[PDB]
Design a binder for these strands. Structure first.
Length: 69
DNA sequence: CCTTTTCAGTAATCTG
DNA sequence: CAGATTACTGAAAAGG
């Protein structure tokens, strides 16, 4: 299985830069997987695999998301 | 390592 | 249908 989120959801997670572009930073540098969205205008909108973010970061996102078990 | 600004394309949306 | 606009991000650069 896997999960995906929009930069605004991740950038809002602790441990994350805190800026839409900041996310793209680690994204290309770390090589985050990305699901290209479509229903969103511009079509440039793409989510990133939270299951691919640093283990520590995942907890920030999973906790920011409130998923966990 | 992070922050912020500008640039550009298309995508969907709205009307007569 | 036709024309037109707005709206949405992504990308890069520079500096502390």
């Amino acid at each position: 299985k896997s999960i995906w989120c929009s930069p605004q959801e991740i950038m809002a997670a602790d441990g994350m830069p805190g800026s839409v572009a900041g996310v793209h930073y680690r994204a290309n540098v770390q090589g985050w997987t990305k699901r290209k969205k479509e229903g969103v205008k511009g079509g440039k909108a793409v989510e990133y695999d939270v299951m691919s973010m640093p283990t520590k970061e995942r907890e920030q996102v999973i906790a920011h998301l409130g998923l966990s078990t």
